[PDB]
């Protein structure tokens, strides 16, 4: 899915604009390339270039890496993280949970998505009270079930006013929040 989206953006002019706006780095299955790309991404975050790191939620990089102040400032989540519905291993794992312990298949699937999203979006608040915003570009997260299964600390901060902001409104509120975060305690 990441490759398809990247290819579509490349065919259109959005990607060239994105590269001009800020350096762009992408993740690959190979660990060597992943490590090199992340090493350059850190320097970009330090140097004036800045960086947009595209990765996969299930990618080992997402779990291994930790984002701190001036690292992964704004965490963008493109789509609810769901595993493919064809891998037969998950079919056993899921239908057995339905049969025993009485967990609905949809319930467990949404739980597996929300837990993964929280894992991959909760890094920006590592410590030392470093500001940062977590934007989820998916109307599915606006659903009550996803919000309810979301961790309490994020959900309570989340409000109905900004629950389903348009793209432009989200951009404006992000700019304003970054302004407020800028400046001392």
């Amino acid at each position: 899915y990441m490759e398809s989206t990247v290819a579509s953006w490349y065919e259109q002019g959005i990607l060239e604009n994105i590269q001009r706006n800020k350096l762009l780095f992408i993740e690959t299955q190979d660990g060597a390339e992943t490590s090199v790309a992340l090493e350059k991404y850190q320097e970009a975050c330090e140097n004036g270039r800045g960086a947009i790191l595209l990765s996969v939620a299930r990618g080992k990089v997402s779990e291994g890496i930790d984002f701190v102040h001036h690292y992964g400032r704004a965490v963008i989540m493109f789509g609810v993280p769901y595993v493919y519905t064809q891998s037969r291993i998950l079919k056993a794992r899921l239908e057995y949970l339905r049969d025993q312990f009485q967990i609905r298949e949809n319930d467990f699937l949404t739980f597996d998505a929300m837990r993964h999203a929280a894992q991959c979006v909760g890094r920006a608040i590592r410590g030392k009270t470093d500001y940062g915003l977590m934007v989820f570009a998916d109307k599915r997260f606006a659903r009550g079930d996803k919000r309810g299964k979301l961790p309490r600390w994020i959900q309570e901060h989340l409000t109905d006013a900004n629950l389903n902001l348009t793209v432009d409104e989200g951009v404006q509120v992000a700019k304003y929040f970054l302004r407020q975060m800028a400046q001392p305690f």
Binding site: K22, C45, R49, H70, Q180, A182, Q183
Partner: protein, 329 residues
């Protein structure tokens, strides 16, 4: 706290593409230039002996918009001209800082060399690594205090803290005014800073001796017509239209007594007056400062004169007058 009265300051402006974005109510570049005109005029009005220089960086190249000078009007004209600048390209911190370093390297040791980089586009494409240039900056004791826009740049953060300057990011236009007005004042001298005596010259305004007898006609020194009278120099003996100015021959600063006197208030800061809302046995309805009734539950008092000042009186005294009226007595 030791303060460097004489400082050569370079306001590095970036002509980056990101300046095109109209984050502020007007265009970002136009707002920055319009407010920087006020900053320049106020800086000259609060430090006559000091001088300023503007470097505009765009398309990975840095050009000196105006060399070091003591005339605010010339810099103001340069700002007004630059208002129409195309504003396309990418800045280079290495190029801008290298130009500033080249100009400031031969400056006298006693004066404080300072740079204020108004950073707009977070990117910094430079031919050479800037961490190496940071070492040369520290060696040359050139203070660099970046003011970022819509970005907390890491390289500029380390630049500011390592070189001794301060880093800030614009919360809004009102806070931008506050930031630049704060940077107007001379910075305190640190351990690395050193002080040394500087030669100074005080000219006297002169006119025709007696009914244009043995006159001293002359045009100017940096379409000037003939001038019957004007300023002169102890050594150049060359007519100067306006003061203060650096000698075009001697290399010695020509400046009058009032210009020096304008900076004594920096050496003599005014202690903040405690704010007491309640009357506190203050039976004088009329404010001593302005002889006006106190319409608000606020009062200010010194530790010496023990007078009464209203909100406006105290604010004005601490802002502009820089001295307590009654406490002068």
């Amino acid at each position: 706290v030791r303060l460097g009265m004489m400082r050569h300051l370079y306001v590095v402006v970036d002509g980056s593409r990101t300046m095109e974005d109209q984050d502020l109510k007007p265009n970002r570049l136009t707002c920055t230039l319009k407010l920087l005109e006020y900053f320049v005029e106020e800086y000259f009005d609060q430090n006559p002996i000091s001088q300023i220089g503007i470097i505009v960086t765009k398309s990975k190249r840095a050009e000196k918009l105006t060399e070091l000078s003591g005339n605010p009007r010339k810099h103001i004209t340069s700002l007004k001209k630059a208002v129409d600048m195309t504003c396309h390209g990418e800045p280079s911190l290495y190029n801008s800082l290298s130009i500033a370093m080249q100009t400031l390297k031969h400056m006298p040791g006693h004066t404080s060399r300072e740079v204020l980089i108004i950073f707009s586009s977070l990117t910094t494409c430079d031919p050479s690594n800037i961490y190496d240039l940071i070492k040369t900056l520290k060696a040359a004791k050139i203070r660099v205090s970046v003011i970022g826009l819509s970005a907390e740049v890491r390289v500029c953060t380390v630049l500011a803290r390592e070189t001794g300057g301060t880093y800030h990011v614009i919360l809004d236009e009102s806070h931008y005014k506050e930031l630049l007005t704060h940077h107007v004042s001379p910075p305190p001298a640190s351990s690395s800073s050193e002080c040394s005596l500087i030669r100074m010259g005080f000219p006297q305004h002169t006119i025709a001796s007696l009914s244009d007898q043995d006159a001293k006609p002359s045009f100017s020194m940096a379409e000037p017509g003939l001038t019957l009278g004007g300023y002169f120099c102890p050594q150049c003996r060359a007519k100067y239209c306006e003061l203060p100015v650096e000698c075009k021959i001697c290399g010695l600063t020509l400046v009058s007594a009032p210009h020096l006197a304008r900076s004594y208030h920096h050496l003599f800061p005014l202690d903040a007056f405690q704010e007491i809302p309640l009357e506190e046995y203050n039976g004088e309805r009329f404010c001593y400062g302005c002889q006006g009734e106190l319409k608000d539950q606020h009062v200010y008092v010194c530790a010496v004169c023990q007078n009464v000042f209203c909100v406006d009186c105290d604010v004005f005294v601490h802002d502009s007058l820089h001295c307590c009226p009654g406490c002068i007595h």
